[PDB]
Every structure is written in structure tokens, then in C-alpha cells.
Write a protein that binds this ligand. Structure first.
Ligand SMILES: *[C@@H]1O[C@H](CO)[C@@H](O[C@@H]2O[C@H](CO)[C@@H](O)[C@H](O)[C@H]2NC(C)=O)[C@H](O)[C@H]1NC(C)=O
Ligand SMILES: [Cl-]
Ligand SMILES: [Zn+2]
Ligand SMILES: [Zn+2]
Length: 301
């Protein structure tokens, strides 16, 4: 059982970090990331895209001056490796931000074009940019936050959550102490919402998640985003948060829209960067920042 703050504790600090978010950084990474023919987890394509992503993560670390922050691959039985970046804090209580890094063309997995721009390139560059801004905080970069923060870039999600399955099963076996896990998977498609006359929102998924953490996630969005929430269910274990839930860890999941208004282009050649609304992924950047910072600095977790 894990419990959370009732209201945000660091509004001033987080609002100031939010000003350092740079909308252009999403596109600058997402454009070449989605130019891999696909990022299929069984393919040398997915191996190369994971290596490319690791270099982009490393560039941010080396640029940050954060001496103790690392990124390391996590090997699987398939060629594409997951990536775990760690910001060590004073305790081993760990906050995880997740996204998956593979893409797939369901009709032609090995050879088909799969730009995976919304699914899940949008979530990758969302948490990548929040990671960079988090490292501009001197306390975080010094290793001085109460809690440890990890950023997970899961391989093989399109095979059935295969990378996050390997990671959380190992974490569980080694008694890793994950106090919160936020998954972000598809953060850029708003056309489904606005086409129907609805206002742009953050979708909160309420199945296969922890009730207390999900309530905390709504607190984060109400404080640090400028668009409202909408609750939705997917009806199955639709992303890597379900791997955390499977091993008892508290997980939550923020989404681009109500589930029925999400991108109809996923898992095909049509999931392109032209479908992504970078003002919306900026809202997901704000919530990733606030979620990570508020929980990194919660002693009673
Ligand atoms: C977090 O801080 C922001 C300021 O950065 C607060 O927003 C301000 O609210 C007061 C109320 O009148 C005014 O100074 C401005 O209207 C707001 N400023 C901006 C830039 O929006 C915000 O209310 C705080 N939120 C929480 C939850 O504490
Ligand atoms: Cl999906
Ligand atoms: Zn996905
Ligand atoms: Zn998918």
C-alpha cells in the first residue's frame, strides 16, 4: 500500500521549471526518431533505434553536468534493448516515468513502415524533455532529492509489454522499491477530440492502475496543466503500466484524449509526425515535470 500528497507542495519551483520546457525539442528528436523505417523490437531496425535513443539520452546527461546520472541498456531475448536512466537520490524509494520506444506495422511487422510518431514517439520525447529540464534543478542534479527517479524507455511493448515485463519482474525479484510509476503512451493526437467539438484534454486511464496514484495524477494535472482531465478505461492491459501493476507496484497512465478519440493511425504506416500536436505534448511535458518533481521531494513516501 502506497499513499501520496493531497496537494502540490512545490508550485513555485515547478512553475519555474515549466518555463524551461522547449516545444521545439519534441519535434527535433521525434522527426529523426520516426524516420527509422520501423522500430520493430525483433528487427535490427529496433536495435539501431534503441542505440540512437541511448545516444540522445546520453547527450542530455553529458550536457547537464549531473555527475551521478546514468543511462544503461537492459537486454532482452530480442535485439532491441530497453533503456533505464537513473537520477540517484538520498533514498532508494524510486519514482519511474515510462514510455515505450518500439513501433510496429501490424499488417507487416518486420518490413512494414511504422513511423510510430504518436505511438509512442510522442511519449518518448515527452519524458525525454522532462528529464532534461529536471536535470537543470541543482538539488536534483546533485543527487540531493529525497527519492530516486528513473526514466524507462521500454523495448518490445508492441510484442505484449515484453520489455517492461522483464524489468518489473526483475525489480520485484530484487526488492526494488517503486513508489510510483507514470506511463505515457500516445500524448500528441488531439484531432479526434477537437473534430467532435470537444475541448483538448488529458485522458486519465482508470483501469489496471493504482487508485491513490491516479488521484495524485489528477492533482498534478489540475495544478500544472492548462487543459482539463477526462477519465477513461481501455478495457485491457494496454501499455507498460500494466506490467508495473502486475508486480504490485503503484502505476498510473496519462493519455492524449478520451480512449475512444485517440489516434486511429496507430500500428500502420500512417502514424506520422504530421498527426502530432506539439502544443498538446507540451501539456504532457508539464505534467511529467510536476509529477516527477513533487514525488522526488516527498519524504513520507
Ligand atoms: C502556482 O503559482 C502560480 C504562479 O506562478 C499561480 O498562478 C497565479 O495565481 C495568482 C492568483 O491571482 C496570480 O498571481 C496570477 O493570476 C497567477 N499567475 C500565473 C502566471 O498564472 C497558481 O495559482 C499557483 N497554483 C497553485 C496550485 O498553488
Ligand atoms: Cl498501443
Ligand atoms: Zn503504445
Ligand atoms: Zn501500439
Amino acid at each position: 500500500a502506497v499513499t501520496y500528497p493531497d496537494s502540490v507542495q512545490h508550485n513555485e519551483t515547478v512553475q519555474n521549471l515549466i518555463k524551461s520546457l522547449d516545444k521545439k525539442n519534441f519535434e527535433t528528436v521525434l522527426q529523426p526518431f520516426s524516420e527509422f523505417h520501423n522500430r520493430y523490437y525483433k528487427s535490427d531496425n529496433g536495435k539501431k533505434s534503441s542505440e540512437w535513443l541511448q545516444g540522445k539520452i546520453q547527450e542530455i546527461i553529458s550536457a547537464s553536468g549531473a555527475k551521478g546520472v546514468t543511462v544503461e541498456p537492459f537486454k532482452h531475448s530480442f535485439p532491441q534493448s530497453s533503456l533505464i536512466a537513473k537520477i540517484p537520490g538520498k533514498s532508494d524509494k524510486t519514482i519511474v516515468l515510462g514510455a515505450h520506444q518500439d513501433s510496429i506495422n501490424l499488417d507487416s511487422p518486420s518490413e512494414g513502415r511504422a513511423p510510430g510518431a504518436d505511438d509512442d514517439g510522442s511519449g518518448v520525447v515527452t519524458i525525454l524533455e522532462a528529464f532534461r529540464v529536471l536535470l537543470t534543478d541543482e538539488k536534483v542534479a546533485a543527487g540531493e532529492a529525497p527519492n530516486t527517479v528513473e526514466f524507462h524507455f521500454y523495448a518490445g511493448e508492441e510484442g505484449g509489454l515484453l520489455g517492461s515485463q522483464d524489468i518489473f519482474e526483475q525489480y520485484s525479484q530484487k526488492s526494488r522499491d517503486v513508489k510510483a510509476m507514470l506511463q505515457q503512451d500516445m500524448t500528441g493526437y488531439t484531432k479526434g477530440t477537437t473534430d467532435a467539438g470537444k475541448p483538448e484534454s488529458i485522458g486519465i486511464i482508470t483501469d489496471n492502475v493504482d487508485e491513490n496514484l491516479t488521484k495524485f495524477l489528477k492533482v498534478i494535472v489540475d495544478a500544472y496543466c492548462t487543459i482539463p482531465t477526462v477519465d477513461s478505461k481501455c478495457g485491457y492491459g494496454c501499455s507498460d503500466h500494466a506490467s508495473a501493476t502486475k508486480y504490485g507496484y503503484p502505476a498510473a497512465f496519462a493519455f492524449e484524449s478520451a480512449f475512444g478519440d485517440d489516434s486511429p493511425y496507430i500500428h500502420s504506416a500512417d502514424d506520422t509526425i504530421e498527426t502530432v500536436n506539439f502544443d498538446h505534448v507540451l501539456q504532457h511535458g508539464r505534467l511529467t515535470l510536476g509529477f516527477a518533481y513533487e514525488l522526488a521531494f516527498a519524504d513520507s513516501l
